[PDB]
Structure formats: structure tokens, C-alpha cells
Design a protein around this ligand. Structure first.
Ligand SMILES: CNc1ccccc1C(=O)O[C@H]1[C@@H](O)[C@H](n2cnc3c(=O)[nH]c(N)nc32)O[C@@H]1COP(=O)(O)OP(=O)(O)OP(=O)(O)O
Ligand SMILES: Nc1nc2c(ncn2[C@@H]2O[C@H](COP(=O)(O)OP(=O)(O)OP(O)(O)=S)[C@@H](O)[C@H]2O)c(=O)[nH]1
Ligand SMILES: C=C[C@@]1(C)CC(=O)[C@]2(O)[C@@]3(C)[C@@H](O)CCC(C)(C)[C@@H]3[C@H](O)[C@H](OC(C)=O)[C@@]2(C)O1
Ligand SMILES: [Mg+2]
Ligand SMILES: [Mn+2]
Ligand SMILES: [Mn+2]
Lengths: 341, 841
């Protein structure tokens, strides 16, 4: 027969649905899994992160109606160089191009524009990139694991992984988060074990690439409300990750972007007294992360009926130890829910 | 009744024969004990005793031979009559030679006890006969005793022993009735269960193939047994590769069935369908469903065949023989197209109402358009067909009229209710027991000790409290309070049955020990009388036949054996061997006897339990099977077909709608393992439409069948009564109300859906129609007419999210109070122009 043993090992696995908003870091988490518990395209898509980055800034300079001109306008042949290769899918990356993005990166409109690229659509991991491209004009040294984790790749289509952690079976799905791909999310609503949700932290002054009109944070609240009251999702507790801790931390150190000037819930807000702090901690950071924690948990207050729960934990995509700790705790909680019935 | 209860004991013959044979063993046991008592001890002065017991013994083994004979059927109860008449002549003949000085009340009375209950238990006489025989034997036996002080108590002994005898008698044969009745209905419902199991097996094997059926045949997953009676509903679909698909349909079907009387079209159409079924069963085929004029089959999705495509195309050449041989049978001018494609198909069943095993793929739609790109006489076969197809045929170009395709041409009596009678009867006989224990005193007026009156007091109070507690527990007054019955029987389990049974059993022996402490042989008449008294009252203990044999028989031995032997020993000269020898036959008698009755009681309980379980299983079988009959075919066509074979029905005015999910094609994308998650979504939707019809007022609508993503239902059939409160157009109007309702239901379905919408369009028509049944052992209820073609071509061309109305429906619905607007006059095949109206404004 062998239907019962195969169907019982079908029971005994650990499938993980990984929903979340667009370009959050879900694929980065799957990369973290294959670094923890588990060959030429990397040069290509990293250098296309480079190209699309630098031409998105350099094109986007004149697009800013606060007039952002070059502090070094003497590289206008490099400006027109980037305007020349602006729309071409094919490029060979000469050292002269490294002189182009190099000498652009010597200019300060690039740097204050990197302080102000959140005003439009642009990547959020280029400060890594231009320093590396300053180093990696040749790539005879193979790029590292952090180099693997910074590699932006657009994610769509169902990708699966089956890795094992100490007699614990992992089969999990990375799913895209763009709007048109949202018709594919019900494909993985078939009785999965757990649902883990990820929202980028600094997305309180930026918008999605669909409309370029409404904040990604309110997009995340709308998404959590749309899943949270479903007639198909009431039997799975949700583990809530809040990625990109440190980018929010350096925007606090910037002190230039305010949620309370946008979302005035934070304006008369006070800090929660049930906290558990971090070493060397600015209280505005704490009131920030506990504010957004209370913002999603406030939506988790509205329903549940003791059926589907809400488990707010925290993580950033640059700590091995955090994925270790809170994901082992995830293994504990999904052990409970894996034997809930 | 009469004959069947007669045949009962005709088959309860050998067991009464058996216990009766060992009653004869008890008779030879009795002649054996007469032989030892008159053999060793005394009476060595006349040996007259031994010979009637010896001929009584050759009666024993001689009628053990005569038990086997065959001149015996209308004889064996009369053989018992012969036996007990030899008993009567034995004891009545041997009694009298007394009054010389010695034999006491105990001897002859003990004889009468053994005779009487050996009669009333086993000898199997009737009511009247054993009745007047026992009574007559009693009165003439006691006047054999004689040749108004103590003889009155003798008659009390006799009438009480008769009353307990007839009690034992009537309870014995009512168990003989009810055991037989439970076993007989147990032997009817088992075979009825098996036959209706075969009927349900026919209903499973008339709608589906064998594999998913045989998953439903052995409860391998109890999700299906839980699916006969929240996250996602369960349904069977498997995504299989390398199958083939054959479509066939009549070209120019418009006018060709005009002048049919709705049985002639059934005649030629179902005749050709019968020849289709013949060639399918001869050509090893997988037929699916009849889509109006189109009929179609596939090639081995449960069983992937080795030369499968050749079976498909030569099978379709079989359909070429069908059109040539049945057409030139009927001399018609007709033809049919055939399109065949090889590809992969996900197959299964959706829905939960009127469902049907169907198939899904764009390879299927490729076969659909090859029928659309078809031509007569030859089979239209694709690239993927001819890429491996052994080239043993006539291949030709299937070219465009305006995708790489070829052509082939050829080559009563309840438990506590009886405990009412054994307790209540036990205490009225206990009443005359202790009454007789005292009103022997006619030469005296009172018993000497007061502790006798104490035993009278607590004994009568305990029996009367058991009396009132049981009788008000049973006869259901429910006036003051009943919770003390629940709270006191709450501790009266199956072991307090043993114990309080031992209480009410054990106390009357102490009540005949109301005369036990001081003197009893100033007059020996008191002594012999109290010995006869306690040996009389000791027989009471069997009346609780509902407790165990070692337990009651041993307890009966204790309380009926202690102070008799022990009070013989304190001191009236020689009585011991005979008095406690007859105690010995008394004790083995009561052990064996109540042993037998409690075994009989246990067997009755067994024979009730098993029949109850089989009754439950036939109840579940009828619900599940008749639930399938309510599934597959409609109701009054089950009233016409249910006891017959044919069906054909004209209809004159009825309503019919289509519903069209638009954007399921763009939502489809199959990058996943079959993409069948999307079919789980679609099946949740169609299941929600299934739940829409279970309203009582919306049970007046009859769903026809499912067609891909096109939904289909009709009304105007459920009104089979000329009622006085049924409007001639009500099902039309409320069917429109249901159409707006299911518009709101699909609105709510996209409300649960995220960032996405499903569009739909619906079309209406009323008109005459045709009720028909097609299949033979694989059936389908179907409708036809021009009207369904009108609503068909309507909703085929209908704009989405709106309600599509015919001009005559425009003529009726406004006067049922509905607003519309003129859309235009859209071209309708068969009608030329037809004037179009829409509901949304
Ligand atoms: C007078 N009208 C009829 C009387 C008795 C039996 C049938 C009809 C009738 O109207 O038949 C039409 C459909 O209702 C009836 N019908 C066909 N398929 C279906 C179908 O799938 N569902 C329903 N409810 N009715 C159907 O077939 C006929 C049209 O078929 P198509 O439009 O699909 O094109 P075709 O199949 O190639 O036929 P043709 O073009 O050669 O003339
Ligand atoms: N600095 C920093 N960068 C991060 C962090 N998390 C993700 N990123 C970067 O963001 C980029 C996008 O992450 P990615 O994994 O592609 O999101 P995704 O959600 O899986 O992509 P999609 O399915 O929504 S389209 C990655 O290149 C990654 O390096 C973080 O916590 N800190
Ligand atoms: C409904 C889903 C989908 C995509 C699947 C499919 O294969 C089809 O159902 C068949 C071929 C298929 O179900 C066979 C029956 C039928 C009714 C002939 C279908 C229609 O042509 C459908 O198209 C229409 C018109 O709905 C189509 C193509 O639609
Ligand atoms: Mg991704
Ligand atoms: Mn046709
Ligand atoms: Mn057709």
C-alpha cells in the first residue's frame, strides 16, 4: 500500500507560507536559510542593481522639483554617458564605466540624493553597492555571503525549499508581493502550517511602484486587514516579523523623517511600559518600534476569537543570531500549532 | 401470531427436547435416590417400593430411545402427559400406607413439591392443562393426607406454590416469545441491508468510474464518511498525462429535430446513443457526458493504454459506422464531426450537487476547436496525434479554410416491568407467608417473642419501600419530584442489583425464623409444621431470574442450608437422611434450575442487542443510498422512473437561465503542480452556489448540471400540483430575484478575494421545453428545446455584470413590477433578429 506512511510523513513536515509586502526581504530570509541549514548570475544581477541604481539616481536628479543639480557639473560627459546607456538591456562593464559611476560617486548630489532617494522609487541597499563597485572593478575574489544577502532580485512565482533542521522538516514558499501577483496568493492557502509576515520598517515615507501615491506602511496595514478577517485564514496563527531594523535606526539618527507628521497617531502617543529593551537605546527608537508593534497589534485586537493568534517578534536581515533565536522560537511555536488539533 | 409462533417451537423443538431429556435425567436421579433410601437405610420389611421406580427407569432410558423417533411431532407434549400421569400414579399410589403408629408432612409434601415444579418448569404443558392438573393433584393429594387448624395452612402452602408456579410459567414462555421475535427481525433486516447495499452499489456505479468508487467502497479516509452527512472542502482531482480526447457532434442540428413528439427524438437520438454505448463498451472507452447535440469520450485516464490513440481513432471510425449504418438505417440527411487530441488532462469532480466526473485541460479545448475546425467523414487529428501514430492510415492535410493538423479516413415483558411482578408478587406471597406463620395459632392468639414482630416490622417496611419506590419509578406520575429517583438509582448500578436482590431474597427466611429461638416440640406438630414451613418458603429465591447462578444459587444454599442441618443437631430420632436428602435434591434442583433461567435471560439480552445494531446499519444505508437518488436525478422523474424503465415528458412553459464566469481563463495560470489550487477556489465557489439552493422557498428551483465554468438551472417543473396558491409566473419572478441574489453572492465572493474581481453574465428565457432521460446504466437527466437555445445564444453574447432579458420576458416582468431598458435587436441564429432588453439601468 504505502499510502499511510507517506501520508503520515506528509503530516509530519513543516510547510511555511511567507507572505508579505513588496520587496521586503522574504527572499533574503530564504537565502539566510540556505546559508544556515544547507553560480555565475551573481555578477550579472548585482551589476544590474548597480546600473539600474546609478541611472535611476542620475536620471532622477532633474526629476526632483526641489532643484537637485550636480555639485560637480564638470562630469557632464559622464552624465550624458549615463543618459546614453539609460535604456539598454546589454552592457559589458568596462573599467571606464567604473570611472563613470566612480566619479559620479565622488559628487555630493549623489550623496544627498542618497539621503533623499526615498522621495521616489530607488533601491535601499546601494550604500553597500557603490563602495563594493569602488572595490570590485575586477571580481577575481569571489564575492562573499553578505554579498549574497545584498543581491536584489525581483521575486515572483512560487519557489520552494526543503531543508532539514535537527529532525525537523522544512518545505517553504517564497511568494511575490507585487499587486498583480496577488492573484497567486490563494495558491498557497491550502492548509499550510504557519504564516509569517514581513514589513519593511522604514517604509513610512515611501510608496509602492504601482501608484506612487500612497504609503507602503498603510499598504501593509490594508494587507494585514485583508488577510486578518478572511473566511480562509482563521485557523493559522501568524508570526509577525518587522524587518529592516537598522535602516529605521539610521533614519532615527537622521531625525529628518517623522511618522507623526504623516500619521498623527504617533503625535500624542506615549511609550509602552511593558517593554523589553536593547543595550544603549534611544527612547525614540523604542517608541517607534513599539508604536508600529502596537499599530499591527491594534489590528490584531479586532478579531481572532481565540482561533488565529498574533505573535509579534522582531528581526533584521543582517543578524545570524537573530534568525537563530527567534526562528528557534518559531520552531517551538509551530511545534505547538503543528500539534494543536 | 398463530402459524409463525407455531413454527418457532417447531424449531425450538430440539432445545426443549434437550432440557427435557435432562429432566428425564433428573427423573432417573429421583428413582436413584428412592433406590438408595430404600436400599441401605431402613424399610427392609417390604420391597414394594422399588419396582415402580425401576419401570420408571426403563421409562427414562426407554423414552430416551423414544426421543429420537418420528411418530413424535404431535406426540411429545402428550408424551410429557403420559410421563406425569405415571408420576401421579406413582406418588398417589405410594402415599397412603400410613397412620399406623410415621411419615410426616415433610415426606409427602416434599414429594408434592418436586412433582409440581418438575411439572411447571420443563414438561411444557399448556396453561389450562397443567393448571387444573396441578390443582386437582393438590386437593386430592391433601385429602390423601387426611385419611381446620393446620390443614388451612396446608392449603395456603398449596395455593401459594401454585401462584409462584404460574408466575414462573408465564415469564418462561413470554421470554420464549420475545427471543424468537427479536431473532426473526434480526434475520430479516440483515438480508434487506445486503440487497439495498447492492442498490446503492448500482447508484455509485451509474455516475462514475471504478477507482474513486472503490475509494468510497471501504472507508479508507473517514473524511468521506464525514462528507456524507470549514477551511476547504474535499474533492478528488488528479493531473494525468498522455491521454487522448474524442469529440463528436452533428452538423446542422438546427431544423433537423423540428417535428419530433419528444419521444421520436428520444427514439433515434437514444437509439444512436444506445449504439454509442455498445461501441464504447466494446471498444474499451471512457464516455463522459452529452452536451446537447455533442457526445464525447476520452482514452484511458484511469488506465493509460499502450496503443490508446489507435483505440480512439478506430473507435471514431466506429462512430463513422454509427452514422453510416444508423443514418442509412433511418434514411436521413445528417453528419457528424470528430476531433481528437493527445495531451495531458487534470480530471476529477467539482461541486457537491448533481456532480459528475469531468475533465479539464486546454488540450480539451484544442479538441473543441478541432471540432470547430472540423469537416465531415474523416477524423480531425492534431500534430501531437500524428507525431507517434505508427503512420498505418490515410494521412491528409487538415488545412485552414482561411495549427499543423492532419486528417485520417481509414486503412410487554420488559425487565424492570417484570421486576415489578417478581417483587410485588414476592411480597404478596410473603404477606401470606408471614400471615400463615402467625395464624396457625388458632389454639393460641399471639406469637411469644416481640422480636418476631420486629422482623415483621422492618421486613414489611423494607418490602413496602422497595414496592413504592419501584412502582412510582415505573408508572410515570411526575407530580411532586423525580430527582430522588435519579439520585437514588444513581447509586443503584449493576452490583446493587445483586445486593438489594439479596436483601429482599434473604429476609423472608428470617421471617419464618420468627418462630425459631425458644421451644418448638412440646407439640411436635409445631416442629414438623415449621420444618415444612421453611422448606416451603425456601423455594422463593428463583424469582430474581436476572442475577447470576453461582451467586444466587450459592447464597440460596447458605440461607436455605444453615439452621436446618445445624438445628437438627441440638437436642427427633431418625429423620435426617430423608429430610436433608430431599434438601439435597432441593438444592441441586434450585442450582440447576435458576442457572438455566439466568442463562436464558442473558441470551435474550444478547438477541436484542445485535438486532438493534443491524437496524441502525440499515438506517444509515437507506439515508446514504436514497441521498444519492436525491442527488443524481430529479424528484417526480424519480416518481415516473422509480417503478418503470422509460421517460419522456412534454413541457409548455418554463424558465431557464445561464450564468457565465467571464475571467476564469485569465486567472487560470498553471505554473504550479497542475494549478489545481485554482480548481479548489472554483470548487469553493460552485459549492457556495450549491448552498444557495438549500432554502425552502428556493427549493423550488432545479439545477440542471455544470458545464465547465457555465452554470445552469431551471424551474417550472416542481409545480406538479394544481394548487390554489401558486401563481402561474411566480417561479419566474423569484428566479429573477435569485439571479440578483447570486449576483450579490459573487460580489461577496470577491469581497473575500483580494485585489481581484470575477465578472459574470446571466441570461433568461421562458418557453416550452423537453424533459428527458438518456443513459443506460450510465445516465443523465436532461432538457431540450428551442428555448434553451435562445437563452444559450443570449448569454453567450451577453455583456457582463448584467441581466439579459428576452422581449417576451420583457413583456411579462414589467407587469410583475420590474424596470428595464431597451438595448437593441441582436442577431439570433434561427430567429434572424431578436429584440433585446436589459435589467440594470
Ligand atoms: C428546436 N430546438 C431543439 C429541440 C430539440 C433538441 C435540441 C434543440 C436545440 O435547440 O439544439 C441546439 C442546442 O440547444 C443544442 N444544444 C447543443 N449543445 C448544447 C449544450 O451544451 N447545452 C444545452 N442546454 N443545449 C445544447 O444543439 C443545438 C445547437 O448546437 P450548437 O449551437 O452548440 O452548434 P452545434 O452543436 O454544432 O449544432 P449545429 O451548429 O450543427 O446546428
Ligand atoms: N539593509 C537591509 N537590507 C535588507 C534587509 N532586508 C532585505 N534587504 C534588502 O532588500 C532587498 C529586497 O529584498 P527581497 O528579499 O528581494 O524582498 P522580497 O520580499 O523577498 O521580494 P518580493 O517577494 O516582495 S518581490 C534585498 O536585496 C535585500 O538585500 C534588511 O533588513 N536590511
Ligand atoms: C472552464 C474552464 C476552461 C478553461 C476549461 C476547459 O477546458 C473548458 O471547460 C472546456 C473545453 C471543457 O470543460 C469541456 C467542456 C466545455 C464546456 C466545452 C469547456 C469550454 O469550452 C470552456 O470554455 C468556455 C466557453 O467556457 C473551457 C475552455 O474552459
Ligand atoms: Mg521576494
Ligand atoms: Mn453540430
Ligand atoms: Mn454543441
Amino acid at each position: 500500500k504505502q499510502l499511510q506512511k507517506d501520508k503520515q510523513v506528509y503530516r509530519a513536515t513543516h510547510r511555511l507560507l511567507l507572505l508579505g509586502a513588496g520587496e521586503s526581504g522574504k527572499s533574503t530570509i530564504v537565502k539566510q536559510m540556505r546559508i544556515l541549514h544547507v553560480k555565475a548570475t551573481k555578477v550579472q544581477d548585482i551589476k544590474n542593481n548597480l546600473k539600474e541604481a546609478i541611472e535611476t539616481i542620475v536620471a532622477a536628479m532633474s526629476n526632483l522639483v526641489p532643484p537637485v543639480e550636480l555639485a560637480n557639473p564638470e562630469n557632464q560627459f559622464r552624465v550624458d554617458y549615463i543618459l546614453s546607456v539609460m535604456n539598454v538591456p546589454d552592457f559589458d562593464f568596462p573599467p571606464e564605466f567604473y570611472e563613470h559611476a566612480k566619479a559620479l560617486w565622488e559628487d555630493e548630489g549623489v550623496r544627498a540624493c542618497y539621503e533623499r532617494s526615498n522621495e521616489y522609487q530607488l533601491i535601499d541597499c546601494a550604500q553597500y553597492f557603490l563602495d563594493k563597485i569602488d572595490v570590485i572593478k575586477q571580481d577575481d575574489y569571489v564575492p562573499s555571503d553578505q554579498d549574497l544577502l545584498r543581491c536584489r532580485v525581483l521575486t515572483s512565482g512560487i519557489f520552494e525549499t526543503k531543508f532539514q533542521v535537527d529532525k525537523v522538516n522544512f518545505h517553504m514558499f517564497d511568494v511575490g508581493g507585487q499587486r498583480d501577483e496577488r492573484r497567486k496568493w490563494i495558491q498557497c492557502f491550502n492548509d499550510v502550517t504557519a504564516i509569517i509576515f514581513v514589513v519593511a520598517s522604514s517604509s513610512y515615507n515611501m510608496v509602492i511602484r504601482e501608484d506612487n501615491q500612497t504609503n507602503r506602511l498603510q499598504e501593509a496595514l490594508n494587507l494585514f486587514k485583508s488577510i486578518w478577517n478572511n473566511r480562509w485564514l482563521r485557523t493559522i496563527s501568524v508570526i509577525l516579523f518587522l524587518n529592516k531594523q537598522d535602516l529605521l535606526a539610521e533614519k532615527v539618527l537622521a531625525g529628518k523623517s517623522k511618522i507623526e507628521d504623516y500619521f498623527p497617531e504617533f503625535a500624542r502617543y506615549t511609550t509602552p511600559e511593558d517593554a523589553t529593551p536593547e543595550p544603549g537605546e534611544d527612547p525614540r527608537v523604542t517608541r517607534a518600534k513599539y508604536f508600529i508593534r502596537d499599530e499591527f497589534l491594534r489590528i490584531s485586537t479586532a478579531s481572532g476569537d481565540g482561533r488565529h493568534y498574533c505573535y509579534p517578534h522582531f528581526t533584521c536581515a543582517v543578524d545570524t543570531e537573530n534568525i537563530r533565536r527567534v526562528f528557534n522560537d518559531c520552531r517551538d511555536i509551530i511545534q505547538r500549532m503543528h500539534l494543536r488539533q | 401470531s398463530v402459524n409463525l409462533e407455531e413454527a418457532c417451537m417447531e424449531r425450538c423443538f430440539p432445545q426443549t427436547q434437550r432440557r427435557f431429556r435432562y429432566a428425564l435425567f433428573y427423573i432417573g436421579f429421583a428413582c436413584l435416590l428412592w433406590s438408595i433410601y430404600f436400599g441401605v437405610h431402613m424399610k427392609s420389611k417390604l420391597i414394594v417400593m422399588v419396582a415402580p421406580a425401576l419401570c420408571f427407569l426403563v421409562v427414562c432410558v426407554g423414552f430416551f430411545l423414544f426421543t429420537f423417533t418420528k411418530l413424535y411431532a404431535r406426540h411429545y407434549v402428550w408424551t410429557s402427559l403420559v410421563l406425569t400421569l405415571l408420576v401421579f400414579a406413582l406418588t398417589l399410589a405410594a402415599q397412603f400406607q400410613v397412620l399406623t403408629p410415621c411419615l410426616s408432612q415433610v415426606g409427602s409434601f416434599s414429594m408434592c413439591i418436586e412433582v409440581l415444579f418438575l411439572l411447571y418448569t420443563v414438561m411444557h404443558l399448556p396453561l389450562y392443562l397443567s393448571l387444573i392438573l396441578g390443582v386437582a393433584y393438590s386437593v386430592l393429594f391433601e385429602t390423601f393426607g387426611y385419611h381446620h387448624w393446620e390443614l388451612l395452612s396446608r392449603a395456603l402452602l398449596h395455593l401459594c406454590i401454585h401462584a409462584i408456579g404460574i408466575h414462573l410459567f408465564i415469564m418462561s414462555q413470554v421470554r420464549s416469545r420475545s427471543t424468537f421475535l427479536k431473532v426473526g427481525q434480526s434475520i430479516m433486516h440483515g438480508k434487506d441491508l445486503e440487497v439495498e447495499k447492492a442498490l446503492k452499489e448500482r447508484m455509485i456505479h451509474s455516475v462514475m468510474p471504478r477507482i474513486i468508487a472503490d475509494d468510497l467502497m471501504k472507508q479508507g479516509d473517514e473524511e468521506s464518511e464525514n462528507s456524507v452527512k470549514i477551511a476547504f472542502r474535499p474533492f478528488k482531482m488528479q493531473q494525468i498525462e498522455e491521454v487522448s480526447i474524442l469529440f463528436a457532434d452533428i452538423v446542422g442540428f438546427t431544423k433537423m429535430s423540428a417535428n419530433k413528439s419528444a419521444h421520436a427524438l428520444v427514439g433515434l437520438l437514444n437509439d444512436l446513443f444506445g449504439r454509442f454505448d455498445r461501441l464504447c463498451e466494446e471498444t474499451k472507452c471512457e464516455k463522459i457526458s452529452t452536451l446537447g447535440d455533442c457526445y464525447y469520450c476520452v482514452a484511458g485516464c484511469p488506465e493509460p493504454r499502450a496503443d490508446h490513440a489507435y483505440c480512439c481513432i478506430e473507435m471514431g471510425l466506429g462512430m463513422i459506422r454509427a452514422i453510416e449504418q444508423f443514418c442509412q438505417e433511418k434514411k436521413e440527411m445528417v453528419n457528424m464531426r470528430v476531433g481528437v487530441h493527445t495531451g495531458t488532462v487534470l480530471c476529477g469532480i467539482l461541486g457537491m450537487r448533481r456532480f459528475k466526473f469531468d475533465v479539464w485541460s486546454n488540450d480539451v479545448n484544442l479538441a473543441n476547436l478541432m471540432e470547430q475546425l472540423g469537416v465531415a467523414g474523416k477524423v480531425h487529428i492534431s500534430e501531437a496525434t500524428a507525431k507517434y501514430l505508427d503512420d498505418r492510415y490515410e494521412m491528409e492535410d487538415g488545412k485552414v479554410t482561411e495549427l499543423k493538423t492532419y486528417l485520417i479516413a481509414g486503412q410487554f415483558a420488559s425487565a424492570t416491568f417484570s421486576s415489578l411482578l417478581d417483587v410485588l408478587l414476592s411480597t404478596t406471597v410473603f404477606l401470606i407467608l408471614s400471615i400463615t406463620c402467625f395464624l396457625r395459632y388458632g389454639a393460641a392468639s399471639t406469637p411469644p417473642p416481640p422480636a418476631a414482630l420486629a422482623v415483621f416490622g422492618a421486613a414489611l417496611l423494607l418490602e413496602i419501600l422497595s414496592l413504592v419506590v419501584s412502582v412510582r419509578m415505573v408508572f410515570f406520575l411526575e407530580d411532586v419530584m423525580t430527582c430522588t429517583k435519579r439520585l437514588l438509582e444513581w447509586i443503584a448500578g449493576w452490583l446493587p442489583r445483586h445486593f438489594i436482590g439479596a436483601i429482599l431474597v434473604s429476609l423472608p427466611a428470617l421471617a419464618v425464623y420468627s418462630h425459631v429461638t425458644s421451644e418448638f416440640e412440646t407439640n411436635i406438630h409445631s416442629t414438623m409444621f415449621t420444618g415444612s414451613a421453611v422448606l416451603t418458603a425456601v423455594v422463593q429465591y428463583c424469582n430474581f431470574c436476572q442475577l447470576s447462578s453461582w451467586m444466587r444459587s450459592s447464597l440460596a444454599t447458605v440461607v436455605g442450608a444453615g439452621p436446618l442441618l445445624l438445628l437438627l443437631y441440638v437436642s427427633a430420632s431418625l429423620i435426617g437422611q430423608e429430610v436433608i436428602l430431599v434438601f439435597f435434591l432441593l438444592l441441586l434442583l434450585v442450582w440447576f434450575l435458576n442457572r438455566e433461567f439466568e442463562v436464558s435471560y442473558r441470551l435474550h439480552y444478547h438477541g436484542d442487542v445485535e438486532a438493534d445494531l443491524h437496524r441502525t446499519k440499515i438506517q444509515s444505508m437507506r439515508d446514504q443510498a436514497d441521498w444519492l437518488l436525491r442527488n443524481i436525478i430529479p424528484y417526480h422523474v424519480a416518481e415516473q422512473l422509480k417503478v418503470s424503465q422509460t421517460y419522456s415528458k412534454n413541457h409548455d412553459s418554463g424558465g431557464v437561465i445561464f450564468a457565465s464566469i467571464v475571467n476564469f481563463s485569465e486567472f487560470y495560470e498553471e505554473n504550479y503542480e497542475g494549478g489545481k489550487e485554482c480548481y479548489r477556489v472554483l470548487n469553493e465557489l460552485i459549492g457556495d452556489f450549491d448552498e444557495l439552493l438549500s432554502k425552502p422557498d428556493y427549493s423550488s428551483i432545479e439545477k440542471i448540471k455544470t458545464i465547465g465554468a457555465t452554470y445552469m438551472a431551471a424551474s417550472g417543473l416542481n409545480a406538479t400540483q394544481c394548487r390554489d396558491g401558486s401563481h402561474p409566473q411566480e417561479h419566474l419572478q423569484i428566479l429573477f430575484e435569485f439571479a440578483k441574489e447570486m449576483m450579490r453572492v459573487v460580489d461577496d465572493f470577491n469581497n473575500n478575494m483580494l485585489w481581484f474581481n470575477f465578472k459574470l453574465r446571466v441570461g433568461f428565457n421562458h418557453g416550452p421545453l423537453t424533459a428527458g432521460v438518456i443513459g443506460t446504466t450510465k445516465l443523465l437527466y436532461d432538457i431540450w428545446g428551442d428555448t434553451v437555445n435562445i437563452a444559450s445564444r443570449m448569454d453567450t453574447t451577453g455583456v457582463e455584470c448584467r441581466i439579459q432579458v428576452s422581449e417576451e420576458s420583457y413583456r411579462v416582468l414589467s407587469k410583475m413590477g420590474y424596470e428595464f431598458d431597451y438595448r437593441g435587436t441582436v442577431n439570433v441564429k434561427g430567429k434572424g433578429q431578436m429584440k433585446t432588453y436589459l435589467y440594470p439601468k
